[PDB]
């Protein structure tokens, strides 16, 4: 499987520009429900990023377990925080806004200059046997299907009790 052609980078840039505005809406808007809806938009436009790259399961699942359950749960939660419409006008809060918008940008600069010095397209040639197998005849719901249970046995056996404990704790806490 593969992609159409030079239409690729078009959708890439489009989704990137959508996701940037989505994140800015998540972090800027004061009305929390608008923030949650913009978060849902961010997550669907990142599910589309997952789907563009030929990884299908980790896209559709991510769309089902987040753009579904988690967002409606958060919407239900925002029905418990009262009092909105705080101050505004260019870092509404204290100087902590400026201090953050400084340190975060330093973090950016660091990682964003570390990355464009590693030849990723050269780190792909040195591994020409990893993605050269495909097991002989497999599709990409059986790859995960088997390789989840043939060697990832212990964490799969583990996650269930984590889920159960989280359920029990959530019910015991939320209930008065």
């Amino acid at each position: 499987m593969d992609l159409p052609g030079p239409i690729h980078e078009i959708l890439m840039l489009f989704g990137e520009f959508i996701l940037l505005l989505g994140g800015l809406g998540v972090v800027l808007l004061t009305n929390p429900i608008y923030s949650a809806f913009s978060l849902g938009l961010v997550l669907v436009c990142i599910s589309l990023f997952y789907f563009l790259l030929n990884s299908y399961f980790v896209a559709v699942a991510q769309l089902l377990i987040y753009v579904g359950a988690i967002n409606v749960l958060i919407i239900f939660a925002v029905m418990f925080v009262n009092g909105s419409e705080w101050s505004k006008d260019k870092n509404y809060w204290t100087i902590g806004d400026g201090f953050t918008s400084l340190v975060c940008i330093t973090f950016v600069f660091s990682l964003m200059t570390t990355i464009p010095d590693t030849s990723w397209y050269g780190i792909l040639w040195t591994t020409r046997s990893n993605q050269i197998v495909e097991q002989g005849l497999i599709n990409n719901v059986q790859q995960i299907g088997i390789h989840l249970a043939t060697d990832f046995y212990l964490p799969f056996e583990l996650i269930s009790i984590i889920l159960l404990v989280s359920l029990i704790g959530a019910i015991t806490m939320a209930r008065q």
Partner: protein, 48 residues
């Protein structure tokens, strides 16, 4: 020049701690946003 100097020193070595402790103890002090801010500053500077 015994009480005022060497006793002064052997107390100021045990008295400056009494001040430094409470001094650095009254920065931050709650306000989880401040906790996360001071937690990010060190992560960022350590990248050098």
């Amino acid at each position: 020049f015994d009480k005022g100097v060497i006793d002064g020193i052997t107390n100021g070595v045990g008295l400056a701690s009494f001040c430094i402790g409470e001094e650095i103890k009254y920065v931050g002090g709650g306000r989880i946003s401040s906790y996360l801010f001071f937690f990010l500053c060190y992560v960022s500077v350590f990248l050098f």
